[PDB]
Amino acid sequence: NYIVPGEYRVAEGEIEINAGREKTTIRVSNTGDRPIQVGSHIHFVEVNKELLFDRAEGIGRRLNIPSGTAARFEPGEEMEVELTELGGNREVFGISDLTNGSVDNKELILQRAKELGYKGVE
Amino acid sequence: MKINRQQYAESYGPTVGDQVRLADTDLWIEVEKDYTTYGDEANFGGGKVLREGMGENGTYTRTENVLDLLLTNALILDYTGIYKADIGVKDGYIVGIGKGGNPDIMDGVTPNMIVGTATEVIAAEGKIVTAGGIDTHVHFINPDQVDVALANGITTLFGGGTGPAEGSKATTVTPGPWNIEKMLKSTEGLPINVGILGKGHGSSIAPIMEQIDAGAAGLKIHEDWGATPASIDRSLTVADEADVQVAIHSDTLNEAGFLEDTLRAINGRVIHSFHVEGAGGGHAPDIMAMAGHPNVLPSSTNPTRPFTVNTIDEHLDMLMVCHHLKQNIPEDVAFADSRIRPETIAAEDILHDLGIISMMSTDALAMGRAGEMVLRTWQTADKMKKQRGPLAEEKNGSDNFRAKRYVSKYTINPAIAQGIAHEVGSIEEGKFADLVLWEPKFFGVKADRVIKGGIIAYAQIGDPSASIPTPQPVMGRRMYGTVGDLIHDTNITFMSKSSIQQGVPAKLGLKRRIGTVKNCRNIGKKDMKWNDVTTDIDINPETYEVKVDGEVLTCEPVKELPMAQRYFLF
Amino acid sequence: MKINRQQYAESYGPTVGDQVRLADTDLWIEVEKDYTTYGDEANFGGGKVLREGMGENGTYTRTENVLDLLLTNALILDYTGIYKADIGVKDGYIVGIGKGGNPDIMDGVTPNMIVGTATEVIAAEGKIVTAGGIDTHVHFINPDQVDVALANGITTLFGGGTGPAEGSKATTVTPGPWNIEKMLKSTEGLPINVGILGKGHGSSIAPIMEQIDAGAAGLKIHEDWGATPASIDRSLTVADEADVQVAIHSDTLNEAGFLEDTLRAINGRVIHSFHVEGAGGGHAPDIMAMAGHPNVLPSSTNPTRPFTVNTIDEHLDMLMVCHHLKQNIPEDVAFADSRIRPETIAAEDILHDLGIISMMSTDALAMGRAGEMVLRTWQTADKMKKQRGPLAEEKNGSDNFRAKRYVSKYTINPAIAQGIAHEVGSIEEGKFADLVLWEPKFFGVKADRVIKGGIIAYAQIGDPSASIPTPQPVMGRRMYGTVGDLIHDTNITFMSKSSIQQGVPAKLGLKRRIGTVKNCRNIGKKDMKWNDVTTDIDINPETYEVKVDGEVLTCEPVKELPMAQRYFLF
Amino acid sequence: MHLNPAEKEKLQIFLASELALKRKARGLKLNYPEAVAIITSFIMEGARDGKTVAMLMEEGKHVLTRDDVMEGVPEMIDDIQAEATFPDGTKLVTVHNPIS
Amino acid sequence: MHLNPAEKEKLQIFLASELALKRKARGLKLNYPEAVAIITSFIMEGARDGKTVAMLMEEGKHVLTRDDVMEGVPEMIDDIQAEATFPDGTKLVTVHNPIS
Amino acid sequence: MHLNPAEKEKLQIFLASELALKRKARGLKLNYPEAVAIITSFIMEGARDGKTVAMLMEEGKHVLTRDDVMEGVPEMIDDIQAEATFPDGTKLVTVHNPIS
Numbered sequence A: 001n002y003i004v005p006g007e008y009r010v011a012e013g014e015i016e017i018n019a020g021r022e023k024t025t026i027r028v029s030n031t032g033d034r035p036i037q038v039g040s041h042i043h044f045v046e047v048n049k050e051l052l053f054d055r056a057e058g059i060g061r062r063l064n065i066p067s068g069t070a071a072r073f074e075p076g077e078e079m080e081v082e083l084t085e086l087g088g089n090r091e092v093f094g095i096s097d098l099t100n101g102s103v104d105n106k107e108l109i110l111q112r113a114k115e116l117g118y119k120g121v122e
Numbered sequence B, C: 001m002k003i004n005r006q007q008y009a010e011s012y013g014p015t016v017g018d019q020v021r022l023a024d025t026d027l028w029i030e031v032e033k034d035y036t037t038y039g040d041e042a043n044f045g046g047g048k049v050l051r052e053g054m055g056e057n058g059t060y061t062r063t064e065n066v067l068d069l070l071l072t073n074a075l076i077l078d079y080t081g082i083y084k085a086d087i088g089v090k091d092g093y094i095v096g097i098g099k100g101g102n103p104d105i106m107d108g109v110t111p112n113m114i115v116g117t118a119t120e121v122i123a124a125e126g127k128i129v130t131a132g133g134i135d136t137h138v139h140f141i142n143p144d145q146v147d148v149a150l151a152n153g154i155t156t157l158f159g160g161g162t163g164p165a166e167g168s169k170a171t172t173v174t175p176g177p178w179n180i181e182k183m184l185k186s187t188e189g190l191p192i193n194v195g196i197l198g199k200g201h202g203s204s205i206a207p208i209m210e211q212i213d214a215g216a217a218g219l220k221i222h223e224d225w226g227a228t229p230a231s232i233d234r235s236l237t238v239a240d241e242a243d244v245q246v247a248i249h250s251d252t253l254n255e256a257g258f259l260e261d262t263l264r265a266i267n268g269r270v271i272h273s274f275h276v277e278g279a280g281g282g283h284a285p286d287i288m289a290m291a292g293h294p295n296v297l298p299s300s301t302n303p304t305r306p307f308t309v310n311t312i313d314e315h316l317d318m319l320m321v322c323h324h325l326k327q328n329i330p331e332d333v334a335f336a337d338s339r340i341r342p343e344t345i346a347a348e349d350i351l352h353d354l355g356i357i358s359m360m361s362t363d364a365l366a367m368g369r370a371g372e373m374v375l376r377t378w379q380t381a382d383k384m385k386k387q388r389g390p391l392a393e394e395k396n397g398s399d400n401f402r403a404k405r406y407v408s409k410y411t412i413n414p415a416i417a418q419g420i421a422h423e424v425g426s427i428e429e430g431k432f433a434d435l436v437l438w439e440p441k442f443f444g445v446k447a448d449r450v451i452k453g454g455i456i457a458y459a460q461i462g463d464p465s466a467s468i469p470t471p472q473p474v475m476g477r478r479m480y481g482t483v484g485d486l487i488h489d490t491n492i493t494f495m496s497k498s499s500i501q502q503g504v505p506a507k508l509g510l511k512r513r514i515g516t517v518k519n520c521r522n523i524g525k526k527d528m529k530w531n532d533v534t535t536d537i538d539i540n541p542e543t544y545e546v547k548v549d550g551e552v553l554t555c556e557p558v559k560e561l562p563m564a565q566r567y568f569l570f
Numbered sequence D, E, F: 001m002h003l004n005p006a007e008k009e010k011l012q013i014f015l016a017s018e019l020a021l022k023r024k025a026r027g028l029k030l031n032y033p034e035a036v037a038i039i040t041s042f043i044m045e046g047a048r049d050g051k052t053v054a055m056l057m058e059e060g061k062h063v064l065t066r067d068d069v070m071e072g073v074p075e076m077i078d079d080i081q082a083e084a085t086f087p088d089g090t091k092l093v094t095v096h097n098p099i100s
């Protein structure tokens, strides 16, 4: 009974994030010479052009990491990340202007990604 | 992927089942429910969620379900519950309590809580958020009293006075049309919500009523103006016509009657009984019996709260010196001894705990402390837990029931009593965005940020010359909501329906938001949230012993309180 | 009769060829020219020249070429020159720079600088007079920040915020129509010129544009709201339509692109690059390469200015604690190390000296000091003189070239960037009379008197109870220009053309002078006075080495600065 | 520190008391504001020490005597009041006729 | 003197620190604002002495220990920040967990 | 106490002087505001002691010497002025070139 003012007594257990959504693991390479850090809620297909990965597998997805955290890629670094599915209406607007609509429009997203030089489009 | 609960609470504030200590008290509040979707929590900053195309929507204009302000991850403590939610504000009002963000990509977004281009963000993770305090016993004596109130989380002052005039130093009264008009004008410069009470004294209706038509929000009956059967009766006749509240400080001296005579004059009509314990004033020794009646809305003032080892010595001396009473005049000693009573002060602690006294208030600068209504509410709850134990209705080891009973006493209940709970007094959708953020370590002691009408008015913040706002000295300061013309939009002048219909605001050039006082005459004790108990209170005329349900109500004074010497520099 | 030069300078201030040390720096300014007629100098007091029938004209009404205010014998330091003149003010504007007095009896009187019955006098002999500082990176967090700015000679604050909300604590943003309206109202009570930036974030035009129509004067793109290609593009499309400036704090994380991606989104359009060195924010590690481009108006914020032995330790720790970064999380350490770089901070000193970074600013209360923009400008110039020598373009042993290059960085250049240089930013005929008098011993440290719209707003002055104004304690105090309704006429709210055309001032009840933002979209680096250099800046991604014209830009940090411990009590 | 308005104000009393005590130490008879400041600061420091209201009502009458103050000062001071945070929260102390 | 707003404000910190040091000298465990004031004033006086930011980050952790303050005060103070004029101009010092 | 505005303000001078004297006691050469504060407070305490205006004009020139202050401070201070309540009411003291 030492008193820490305002202290918490948290309950037992763990909090599962993004429960019930499909998860996907992919390899991603920072082919650039400057570091890239990617936040939890950016539409993954729209990240920095110099990140090389299968861009199709980023469509409709974001990093499966706690809200407000980020994954870091040092220059030249390749690592695996885990993605979860976007929710809500599953639409994206703005960011890199690759989607501007439903994430279901895969062919159109990839065509834009390819024309603008986002790495990893077939 | 899973996050352990300690880490989760550190990042986003506590979630369901987690408990938080209130300051350095023994009181624990438990999160009852959480509106979030785990993994889509809102947060703001570098690489955080509330960014364009992500948790911030880049499509919608302000009118299209977008907020002006989102408070993220608040732990709400309110009569309505103790729970985790985002709070959305628009046009100065609370418009949504739920989950904010971007429906493009997030699950569970409350449909009118879109974060858009128009949206400001306040991070409330790890804070407790309450409604602004509603103080209904304010003497307007010294304008420096406003910051004192804001610093302890008070956002509405109801009372009266013209500054340090003797009438105002004794009574919460702004008397007559002209003094009322002058103080409505003064109010334009006070960064807090205000309602003004007229003098509830007269034997003809017209002298009283003309105060209401001039812009008063209510009346005060005070013994120092003659708390006679006639003044009581005429004031309540006025109030019943005008739909405003009447507060009473009854005839301590029993000059024109005893308590039963005052109750007969009241005649079943609604009335707010101030400092009902009676040290602050009222029929000696039994005024506190008022608190058992169904037509009485009973409040305490704060210097008796709670009962401590210095209380009696402090009050006996204060009473003598302030009334110019002499220690060698037996009538003066007898009067003091009849008015300052350990028996009724001790019982007042327990009556609060039992929900028989519904409200707290200050009695600022007359016999109470402008900045200690919230402070002393929680010291009382803490003392009662230590002496009486967890209330029977508690579970999970939390003090949630007691915390909702006690937070009601200075938020929603005064607002209901005054006829202003349509605008203020609780964190509910559709009410004005008067919100207080508290660090739990300072809960009930020093507010972190006080939001008035959706803009920060007051904050504990540091050196204005620094690279960042947290370097010393950290002190209470007025923020932009108080500056220039924004003081008009962030605060409410509460006024009678008749004064508003008669165009008093336009006549005087008032630019503040105007609030209407209403629905004060067909409430009772049963309308006091969590504090609705009616009962026969017996006060023994010889011993001053208080009984409820045949049982004497007594407790001991304490030598030490929490929320005291750990916090204050003086 | 002849006067020796020492005596002359003591009586009337310095004249042609004379030099003056700036504070306790090694920087000397030389009087380039003098508008006086020797023997007919204006001066005021007992038996002095400005008396009726003598140097004061007794014939002419105010309208007939008579001044409201004459500043006698000023040493002007301005982008336009370093020279001696009388300064004449009328209707709150500078109307004449030349020679004031009475054409009845004096030679060389500038025809609209008659001293008449209507004319007030300020003695500026022995003072340096500059334009008021223009700070274009202000976070509105704490209203106490205004006096801090005035005390160091700042007269215009451009930026954003709603007080100590997290959005405002991170970003110079007042988001959306409602927050903008509220802060325009607040501004009515702030004794300084103000322009407000909206949120430069969105993927549709309308949510952004509606901020401009509501009364914003510009936009801020900030990474904390998502400094994405889309937000950049839409903001600049808005700006090009509305004729306002856009400021950017780019994507430090390189999340959606590297610097070249941000430049491609900009697409040759005009933009103001904030804290271009990058410690304050931006693409790691190479953001400072922005400063070489012809469409970029580059500013520094002040805590990196200039590079000292405590700079790196201070900034690394500040960054970690303010971002809740942990010393034991390698990603957090890597991020900090990528952002706080001695190589780019050292090079920033030299880029200022070379005229490649055009502007200074504060970053007040977010990562910069409200009252140190002017201070640190001159500490930088002083350090550069010590380390690099007199610039090649200097002569006579003076530092005039460097002084005009550096005074431009916080006067005329921010004003040009923001589209407000028609009103403020220099001592020229036809501009608003925002003037700062400095004792040379306090130059750039503590302003003597700050004139706003032709009335003193702020002064270092003593005991108000004394027989005279100079007894202790001498401290910074608000003067009559700040009091009552005069605060409206002495200060400017800068607003978009569209908000002015749509009647926003009348709608909100704004009584301040309204200034129009214009001519921001067809300027570039070439328009920055004395700081117009474009070049290829290379930043080595491995070593963070900065090269310009194939040469590494490096300098050492200093252990001591002038304008520091000699002056300040803390 | 999180100073509230009263804490800020009451620093002034301590400061005035320190000033007054310096003046007393170099042999000056104290004036009206000096005397009030010394006794007031004494009360607030006593509360901080954990004394009772009753103890401070007694002690405050013996902090300064007639011969510490100028002619007339004892009769100018009818009572001195201060509020401070005791272990049991804020309380009011009134010291009646502190200087006999 | 030409005091600016910050200089005026920061006099308050020194004053509170002096008050706190008096209280510590008569044997009181210090409270939250007392402790913050002592450590803050220490930082600003160190800058005036010409110490480095790095020196003050170290020293500020050893100005007060657990046994100088009331129960809970160490855990209430996560860090103390002050700006002061060093020989090389204003700098920010943050002292992390000053009281272990 | 019934403090008026000037009394409130002038407490600040005493406080700054105390701060400055502490700094001098630990061996620092004093800066411009420190020096002004010490000399100003000296004047006001002298008035309180009952010295004459003429005495204080003399004494104020010998409170600090060159070797007590930083380079340039003597030449920055042309004169220091203070008003204080002498036995014969408020008077103005000006000390010319206080530090030679």
Ligand code: NI
Residues within 6 Å of the ligand: B249, B274, B275, B280, B281
């Ligand atoms: Ni009463």
Ligand code: NI
Residues within 6 Å of the ligand: B137, B139, B170, B171, B172, B363, B366, B367
């Ligand atoms: Ni009362």
Ligand code: NI
Residues within 6 Å of the ligand: C249, C274, C275, C280, C281
């Ligand atoms: Ni920035």
Ligand code: NI
Residues within 6 Å of the ligand: C137, C139, C170, C171, C172, C363, C366, C367
């Ligand atoms: Ni900024």
Ligand SMILES: [O-]
Residues within 6 Å of the ligand: B170, B249, B275, B280, B281, B363, B366, B367
């Ligand atoms: O009362």
Ligand SMILES: [O-]
Residues within 6 Å of the ligand: C170, C249, C275, C280, C281, C363, C366, C367
């Ligand atoms: O910034």
